[PDB]
Design an enzyme around this catalytic site. Sequence first.
Site, PDB file in Angstrom:
ATOM      1  N   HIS A   1       0.808  -1.229   0.000  1.00  0.00           N
ATOM      2  CA  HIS A   1       0.000   0.000   0.000  1.00  0.00           C
ATOM      3  C   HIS A   1       0.840   1.278   0.000  1.00  0.00           C
ATOM      4  CE1 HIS A   1      -3.795   1.912  -0.287  1.00  0.00           C
ATOM      5  NE2 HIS A   1      -4.488   1.066   0.461  1.00  0.00           N
TER       6      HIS A   1
ATOM      7  N   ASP B   1      -7.338  -4.342 -20.394  1.00  0.00           N
ATOM      8  CA  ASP B   1      -7.391  -5.223 -21.560  1.00  0.00           C
ATOM      9  C   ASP B   1      -5.980  -5.499 -22.044  1.00  0.00           C
ATOM     10  OD1 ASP B   1      -7.643  -6.429 -24.131  1.00  0.00           O
ATOM     11  OD2 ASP B   1      -9.568  -5.454 -24.458  1.00  0.00           O
TER      12      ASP B   1
HETATM   13  C1  LIG Z   1     -17.162  10.920  -2.452  1.00  0.00           C
HETATM   14  C2  LIG Z   1     -15.843  10.142  -2.710  1.00  0.00           C
HETATM   15  C3  LIG Z   1     -15.012  10.073  -1.402  1.00  0.00           C
HETATM   16  C4  LIG Z   1     -16.197   8.693  -3.098  1.00  0.00           C
HETATM   17  O1  LIG Z   1     -17.297   8.739  -4.015  1.00  0.00           O
HETATM   18  P1  LIG Z   1     -17.281   7.959  -5.461  1.00  0.00           P
HETATM   19  O2  LIG Z   1     -18.180   6.761  -5.388  1.00  0.00           O
HETATM   20  O3  LIG Z   1     -15.912   7.520  -5.809  1.00  0.00           O
HETATM   21  O4  LIG Z   1     -17.853   8.953  -6.656  1.00  0.00           O
HETATM   22  P2  LIG Z   1     -17.875  10.626  -6.705  1.00  0.00           P
HETATM   23  O5  LIG Z   1     -18.620  11.211  -5.515  1.00  0.00           O
HETATM   24  O6  LIG Z   1     -16.498  11.176  -6.779  1.00  0.00           O
HETATM   25  O7  LIG Z   1     -18.645  11.027  -8.124  1.00  0.00           O
HETATM   26  C5  LIG Z   1     -19.624  10.168  -8.625  1.00  0.00           C
HETATM   27  C6  LIG Z   1     -20.738  11.071  -9.232  1.00  0.00           C
HETATM   28  O8  LIG Z   1     -20.282  11.676 -10.566  1.00  0.00           O
HETATM   29  C7  LIG Z   1     -21.244  11.024 -11.663  1.00  0.00           C
HETATM   30  N1  LIG Z   1     -20.521  10.847 -12.892  1.00  0.00           N
HETATM   31  C8  LIG Z   1     -20.379   9.786 -13.690  1.00  0.00           C
HETATM   32  N2  LIG Z   1     -19.611  10.141 -14.706  1.00  0.00           N
HETATM   33  C9  LIG Z   1     -19.273  11.435 -14.543  1.00  0.00           C
HETATM   34  C10 LIG Z   1     -18.501  12.298 -15.296  1.00  0.00           C
HETATM   35  N3  LIG Z   1     -17.715  12.396 -16.475  1.00  0.00           N
HETATM   36  N4  LIG Z   1     -18.325  13.553 -14.899  1.00  0.00           N
HETATM   37  C11 LIG Z   1     -18.894  13.987 -13.772  1.00  0.00           C
HETATM   38  N5  LIG Z   1     -19.654  13.143 -13.029  1.00  0.00           N
HETATM   39  C12 LIG Z   1     -19.835  11.865 -13.430  1.00  0.00           C
HETATM   40  C13 LIG Z   1     -21.634   9.898 -11.089  1.00  0.00           C
HETATM   41  O9  LIG Z   1     -22.856   9.404 -11.653  1.00  0.00           O
HETATM   42  C14 LIG Z   1     -21.849  10.370  -9.550  1.00  0.00           C
HETATM   43  O10 LIG Z   1     -22.948  11.300  -9.457  1.00  0.00           O
HETATM   44  P3  LIG Z   1     -23.955  11.174  -8.159  1.00  0.00           P
HETATM   45  O11 LIG Z   1     -23.183  11.178  -6.870  1.00  0.00           O
HETATM   46  O12 LIG Z   1     -24.964  12.347  -8.124  1.00  0.00           O
HETATM   47  O13 LIG Z   1     -24.662   9.850  -8.327  1.00  0.00           O
HETATM   48  C15 LIG Z   1     -15.016  10.899  -3.832  1.00  0.00           C
HETATM   49  O14 LIG Z   1     -14.725  12.175  -3.423  1.00  0.00           O
HETATM   50  C16 LIG Z   1     -13.726  10.127  -4.127  1.00  0.00           C
HETATM   51  O15 LIG Z   1     -12.767  10.322  -3.475  1.00  0.00           O
HETATM   52  N6  LIG Z   1     -13.664   9.132  -5.231  1.00  0.00           N
HETATM   53  C17 LIG Z   1     -12.415   8.377  -5.467  1.00  0.00           C
HETATM   54  C18 LIG Z   1     -12.453   7.288  -4.365  1.00  0.00           C
HETATM   55  C19 LIG Z   1     -11.098   6.585  -4.111  1.00  0.00           C
HETATM   56  O16 LIG Z   1     -10.134   6.834  -4.726  1.00  0.00           O
HETATM   57  N7  LIG Z   1     -11.135   5.587  -3.053  1.00  0.00           N
HETATM   58  C20 LIG Z   1      -9.922   4.787  -2.591  1.00  0.00           C
HETATM   59  C21 LIG Z   1      -9.075   4.196  -3.700  1.00  0.00           C
HETATM   60  S1  LIG Z   1      -7.466   3.905  -2.835  1.00  0.00           S
HETATM   61  O1  LIG Z   2      -8.880   0.963  -1.969  1.00  0.00           O
HETATM   62  C1  LIG Z   2      -7.659   0.896  -1.791  1.00  0.00           C
HETATM   63  C2  LIG Z   2      -6.675   0.400  -2.768  1.00  0.00           C
HETATM   64  C3  LIG Z   2      -7.091   0.121  -4.018  1.00  0.00           C
HETATM   65  C4  LIG Z   2      -6.264  -0.432  -5.066  1.00  0.00           C
HETATM   66  C5  LIG Z   2      -6.911  -1.049  -6.140  1.00  0.00           C
HETATM   67  C6  LIG Z   2      -6.186  -1.630  -7.160  1.00  0.00           C
HETATM   68  C7  LIG Z   2      -4.793  -1.592  -7.113  1.00  0.00           C
HETATM   69  O2  LIG Z   2      -4.020  -2.154  -8.108  1.00  0.00           O
HETATM   70  C8  LIG Z   2      -4.130  -0.992  -6.035  1.00  0.00           C
HETATM   71  C9  LIG Z   2      -4.871  -0.430  -5.013  1.00  0.00           C
HETATM   72  O3  LIG Z   2      -7.135   1.263  -0.588  1.00  0.00           O
HETATM   73  C10 LIG Z   2      -7.996   1.242   0.575  1.00  0.00           C
HETATM   74  C11 LIG Z   2      -7.484   2.353   1.490  1.00  0.00           C
HETATM   75  C12 LIG Z   2      -7.920   2.156   2.880  1.00  0.00           C
HETATM   76  C13 LIG Z   2      -7.567   3.308   3.800  1.00  0.00           C
HETATM   77  O4  LIG Z   2      -7.921   3.174   5.017  1.00  0.00           O
HETATM   78  O5  LIG Z   2      -6.952   4.284   3.277  1.00  0.00           O
HETATM   79  C14 LIG Z   2      -8.572   1.081   3.324  1.00  0.00           C
HETATM   80  C15 LIG Z   2      -8.904  -0.046   2.436  1.00  0.00           C
HETATM   81  O6  LIG Z   2     -10.213   0.150   1.979  1.00  0.00           O
HETATM   82  C16 LIG Z   2      -7.907  -0.117   1.269  1.00  0.00           C
HETATM   83  O7  LIG Z   2      -8.154  -1.224   0.434  1.00  0.00           O
END
Ligand SMILES: CC(C)(COP(=O)(O)OP(=O)(O)OC[C@H]1O[C@@H](n2cnc3c(N)ncnc32)[C@H](O)[C@@H]1OP(=O)(O)O)[C@@H](O)C(=O)NCCC(=O)NCCS
Ligand SMILES: O=C(/C=C/c1ccc(O)cc1)O[C@@H]1CC(C(=O)O)=C[C@@H](O)[C@H]1O
Length: 435
Positions: free
Chosen positions: A164, A382
Amino acid sequence: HMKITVRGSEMVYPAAETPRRRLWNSGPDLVVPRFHTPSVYFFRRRDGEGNDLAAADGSFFDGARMRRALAEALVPFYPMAGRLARDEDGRVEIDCNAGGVLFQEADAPDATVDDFGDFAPTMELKRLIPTVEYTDDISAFPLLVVQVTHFKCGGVAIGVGMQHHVADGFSGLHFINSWADLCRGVPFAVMPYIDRSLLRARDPPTPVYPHVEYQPAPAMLSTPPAAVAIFRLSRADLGRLRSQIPAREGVPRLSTYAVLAAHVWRCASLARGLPADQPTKLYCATDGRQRLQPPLPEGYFGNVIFTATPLADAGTVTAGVAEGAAVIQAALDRMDEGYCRSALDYLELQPDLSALVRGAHTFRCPNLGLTSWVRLPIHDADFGWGRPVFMGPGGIAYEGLAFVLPSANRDGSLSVAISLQAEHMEKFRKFIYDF
Ligand SMILES: CC(C)(COP(=O)(O)OP(=O)(O)OC[C@H]1O[C@@H](n2cnc3c(N)ncnc32)[C@H](O)[C@@H]1OP(=O)(O)O)[C@@H](O)C(=O)NCCC(=O)NCCS
Ligand SMILES: O=C(/C=C/c1ccc(O)cc1)O[C@@H]1CC(C(=O)O)=C[C@@H](O)[C@H]1O
């Protein structure tokens, strides 16, 4: 228990010169959970219309081809080929030493992709990702381990374990999808940006919030077997849930994440039988790329996860989705540039970041973590033989931790994969549809 036989394993190294260096990790890089983040891809041998997806040369996830593309991908993404280490002050960093990544092929001659059902992140799925042995030597293991498993049906799984510290979901998938692109024979669009000093704290650090998200999670006011499951909500289900929240002229529209999260939080709290006065904290990983100003370079390679932590008495959360959603959205709306910037400073002032690492004690009952992959490109890998029919977490390490997944098709459904105590899951299963 499925018969899976590993054909054999290979360390794969960058296919050209890469910088030999120590790579500093930012605060956000250091407080994500320990060990390797698991994800699994499934690919079927035929497309929906029934045509074989083997390429013209007969290939279908040819290991050699995949390993060549992997070695090419590790040149620009070279920290992925490194090892963990510590600097002179004991702070974890990435030793970019071209130690390489693990790649192995396996066969499951009796099982099919159909046998995995709904693809819930049970131990059944975890077996599709290589196992890492953790010892006190943090430099001992690869940062990336991959297994390609071939099934009776002709289908394939790709299991990925990614340490991570190296990347969050956006960067991790940037790597996997770039590897896929190379394998497919197309150049990838965005070169990674490798320097993490862009997330250095200000000097002097000047935090200007308490940063509730890094304070200890509530304990119960007052070991268990932990179950894992996945639940789909159709687009129609999601709309009906949303329609349960009053739309008022003054009040701005709640995000779908906040509505769904409130529903999960409510159902989990009820299933757990929390008393109304029990505090409960929900941990929501938030992508800081969408919040820092000016934005980071497009290919910024690392973790940019900040954490929103709505916190309320269980009586508030269980009173209804509308009340919970309002609390979640307020917590999300706090996470602007000023707040994320302050967080970097706050982390810089901590004597020991290992103490803030999120783990079992973070997410367990009465609290919860709900990580969204909805906007992550989890279906874009893909390699030249089609897009995956499913991608999701390869396991859930911690009771109380959950994931929101987008559908692999166009139907607008969302799935919640979640770990709870077994007794609580039996209620949660019912409650999540009881509205
Ligand atoms: C709120 C949050 C915390 C998580 O929410 P999320 O499920 O990922 O989705 P978001 O809130 O960012 O945006 C989704 C919205 O944009 C809409 N959408 C779809 N395509 C879109 C596009 N091109 N442009 C703008 N909006 C779009 C979606 O339908 C949705 O709308 P709604 O909330 O009214 O239904 C967000 O701020 C975020 O951080 N997303 C990334 C999450 C992430 O990286 N998690 C951990 C990985 S380590
Ligand atoms: O959601 C992710 C990682 C996603 C991811 C997906 C595909 C990859 O190849 C590498 C990382 O991180 C999350 C981060 C997280 C936190 O407390 O910050 C808690 C868990 O929910 C993790 O799993």
